[PDB]
Ligand binder design. Structure first.
Ligand SMILES: N[C@H](Cc1c[nH]c2ccccc12)C(=O)O
Ligand SMILES: [Ca+2]
Ligand SMILES: [Zn+2]
Ligand SMILES: [Zn+2]
Length: 273
């Protein structure tokens, strides 16, 4: 797998920040900042060679969208998916929640094209709408994916809040192979990890698709032992700006975003062979 350039991930975050500022301060479902976010990500993927689909749904009286991007080729009976919700709450720009995961998944998708990678498994990336309404976009996707296509899914990897400013390094404790792949990446860095309905992997998990993911913490407070292993500040939230107007470009830990973006790519490469 390639090393995902941190600067490229941060440049996507800058673009999402600007989109929020241009659209009433947020990127929330039903509001123009969300669809502008979708248009940004879709344009980068289309230029890289992806087959993109805008999947529309209605929730709360407003049109929502999922962005699905298929990398042409690979075994159609073995699909590896990775995704991230692209909506924010309406109080702010949602840069850590969940620009961070959205930008890491986008840069990994772009890295696939730059590397000329041809995975054995077919690769599909997704950016979910309306996660903050209750996983509505990922539920819509799973609910509308026929059972023959669900059975072709080898895994779903989720990335939701991966740049928290006072981070932990949490790995989902779900499918054992996906979990081992992430934990092995961090082991090679000599960075400890801890085991993690809270995000878009839940609709996949609930229908028996193997899932896993990365998380750097939200509203809970970092313990003394966690500050010993990862630095930062004991007694403060992992993300002091969770769901807040201050979930801005200032609300990112660059080391965590870099490591988790690199880990995302490592897992996507490893699990697609
Ligand atoms: N509620 C999620 C953030 C979140 C909190 N705990 C977890 C565990 C696993 C994934 C995500 C989360 C959100 O608003 O994005
Ligand atoms: Ca990197
Ligand atoms: Zn989130
Ligand atoms: Zn959230």
């Amino acid at each position: 797998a390639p090393d995902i350039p941190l600067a490229n991930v941060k440049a996507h975050l800058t673009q999402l920040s600007t989109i929020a500022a241009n659209n009433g301060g947020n990127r929330a479902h039903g509001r123009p900042g969300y669809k502008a976010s979708v248009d940004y990500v879709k344009a980068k993927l289309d230029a890289a060679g992806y087959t993109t689909t805008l999947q529309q749904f209605t929730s709360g009286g407003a049109t929502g969208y999922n962005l699905i991007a298929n990398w042409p080729g690979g075994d159609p009976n073995k699909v590896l998916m990775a995704g991230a919700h692209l909506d924010s709450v309406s109080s702010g720009a949602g840069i850590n929640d969940n620009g961070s995961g959205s930008a890491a998944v986008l840069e990994t998708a772009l890295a696939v094209s730059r590397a000329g990678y041809q995975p054995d498994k077919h690769l599909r990336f997704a950016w979910w709408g309306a996660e903050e309404l209750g996983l509505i976009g990922s539920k819509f996707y799973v609910n509308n994916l026929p059972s023959a296509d669900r059975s072709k899914l080898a895994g779903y990897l989720n990335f939701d809040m991966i740049g928290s400013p006072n981070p932990g390094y949490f790995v989902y404790d779900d499918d054992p192979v996906i979990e081992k792949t992430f934990k092995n990446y961090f082991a090679g860095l000599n960075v400890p990890t801890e085991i993690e309905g809270r995000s878009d992997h839940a609709p996949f998990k609930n229908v028996g698709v193997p899932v896993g993911g990365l998380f750097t913490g939200a509203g809970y407070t970092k313990s003394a032992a966690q500050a010993q292993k990862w630095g930062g500040t004991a007694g403060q939230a992992f993300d002091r700006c969770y769901h807040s107007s201050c979930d801005s470009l200032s609300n990112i830990n660059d080391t965590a975003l870099d490591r988790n973006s690199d880990a995302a790519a490592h897992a996507i490469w490893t699990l697609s062979s």
